[PDB]
Amino acid sequence: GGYVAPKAVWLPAVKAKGLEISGTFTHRQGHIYMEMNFTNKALQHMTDFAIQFNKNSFGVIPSTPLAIHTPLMPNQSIDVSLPLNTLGPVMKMEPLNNLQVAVKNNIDVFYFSCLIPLNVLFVEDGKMERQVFLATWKDIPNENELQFQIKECHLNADTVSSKLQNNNVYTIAKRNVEGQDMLYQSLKLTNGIWILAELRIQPGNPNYTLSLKCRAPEVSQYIYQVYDSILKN
């Protein structure tokens, strides 16, 4: 499986009259989930749950209701796996992967925000054929190409490739040039955006150079973030 960030308290009890929601995002074999735990720290039950997300950059929306079907009793905790899809309304967020959520019960409507790790939006069919990669790389205007240093990285090229592939970042080609490993990689987002990469791993050099080309270059910074998180974990 891909990288999953540690669970975080998205909505602490103190902000929601005893309601506490902690969660993380996963991508399982097709499918995006918001994996959550709901705890009622109040003295009265909570029921009539509903959820909606603000319009957001990748059109993320719940695909089912919250699986909470009876009152959540004082001091009770329930684990809830909420499937999501990317067929909902779109609006640019800042940061790009920010997600504003509204949860209501019988007591009130509460609001929190959380970042969607950009990796959970990497699709399975993101492996570009070699020759299409070549044509696509050449076609993206070179002013779109942005370079990042993945600093202080102590992994080898095979481990780099294997970790990235576990997260739907595919190594399409490999070359060794002057003792430096060159990996050519591709990924595609849920909204159809293709990102192409050249990663250069140099002798005893602790900084890898990551060159990204994307027709939407504002996304590239976010992809660098992701590579860094994957390779550091």
């Binding site: 029921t47 009539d48 749950f49 509903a50 959820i51 909606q52 603000n54 719940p62 089912t64 209701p65 919250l66 699986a67 909470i68 079907h69 009876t70 504003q100 509204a102 209501k104 409507v109 609001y111």
Partner: peptide, 15 residues
């Protein structure tokens, strides 16, 4: 806070 529309709420069924 952000503005919510009633029809965008995804309500849980009650058993």
């Amino acid at each position: 806070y952000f503005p919510t529309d009633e029809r965008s709420w995804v309500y849980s069924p009650l058993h």
